[PDB]
């Protein structure tokens, strides 16, 4: 897998971020995670956590996995990095996302994220509290 440039356009919610990628606006849906909707418990905290992380970064990158790069809604499917730190893993490590939507061939970082979820759950963080 390879990191590619993108620039933030807008943080949308805990697991959706609009970016400019190869010069075009695209909504990205973060691989392998599920954050609560804004209207559910922890939904506002997940949205806030992703927002701060992408807005504060000097460098945003996207990393596609080995399979499909867009979902049925036209959203990009990628891992998102903010100053080299993976937002997907960070949300899971903080108990603000569950590992979810693990489809074969887009699951390179599955075990990394499950490990983060185990530790969030051991700490009883947020969703796991
Ligand atoms: C994360 C992800 C979601 N999706 C689709 C599955 C779900 O379809 P349905 O909309 O039919 O439930 C939806 C979940 O996204 P959200 O969690 O953003 O709603 O996005 C993919 O197809 N591949 C993916 O990797
Ligand atoms: Ca969601």
Question: Exposed/middle/buried for 15, CB within 10 Å: 0-12, 13-18, 19+?
Answer: buried
Calculate the dihedral angle through the C-alpha atoms of 127, 107, 109, 32, rounding to the nearest 10 degrees: -20
Reported resolution, Å: 1.8
Query: Is residue 114 annotated as a catalytic residue, yes or no?
Result: no
Number of residues that make up the chain? 129
* Closest to 79 (Cα-Cα) out of 97, 95, 125: 97
- Rounded distance between C-alpha atoms, residue 95 and residue 2, angstroms: 27
Q: 65: Cβ below 6 Å to ligand 1?
A: no
DSSP letter string over 26-95? EEEEETTEEPPPTTSTTHHHHHHHHHHHHHH-S-EEEE--SS-SB-TTS-EEEEEEETTEEHHHHHHHTT
- Rounded distance between C-alpha atoms, residue 78 and residue 23, angstroms: 17
Closest ligand (CA of 104): 1
- Rounded distance between C-alpha atoms, residue 91 and residue 80, angstroms: 11
Residue-range domain boundaries for the chain: 1-129
Q: Of the residues 63, 75, 110, 114, which is catalytic? A: 75
* Closest to 98 (Cα-Cα) out of 111, 122, 77, 117: 117
Return the residue whose CA atom lies nearest to atom 2 of ligand 1.
Answer: 101
In this structure, are residues 33 and 15 in contact, taking their beta carbons and an 8 Å threshold?
Answer: yes
> According to the entry, how was the structure determined?
X-ray
3-state secondary structure of 18: strand
Which CATH architecture best describes the domain 1-129?
Answer: Beta Barrel (2.40)
Distance 21 CA to ligand 2 centre (A): 22
3-state secondary structure of 14: coil
């Amino acid at each position: 897998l390879h990191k590619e440039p993108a620039t933030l356009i807008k943080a949308i919610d805990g697991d959706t971020v609009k970016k400019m990628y190869k010069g075009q606006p695209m909504t990205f849906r973060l691989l392998l995670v599920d954050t609560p909707e804004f209207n559910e418990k922890y939904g506002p905290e997940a949205s806030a956590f992703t927002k701060k992380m992408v807005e504060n970064a000097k460098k945003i990158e996207v990393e596609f996995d080995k399979g499909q790069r867009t979902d049925k809604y036209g959203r990009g499917l990628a891992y998102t990095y903010a100053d080299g730190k993976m937002v997907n893993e960070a949300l899971v490590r903080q108990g603000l996302a569950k590992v979810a939507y693990v489809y074969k061939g887009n699951n390179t970082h599955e075990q990394l994220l499950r490990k983060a979820e185990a530790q969030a759950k051991k700490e009883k963080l947020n969703i796991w509290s």
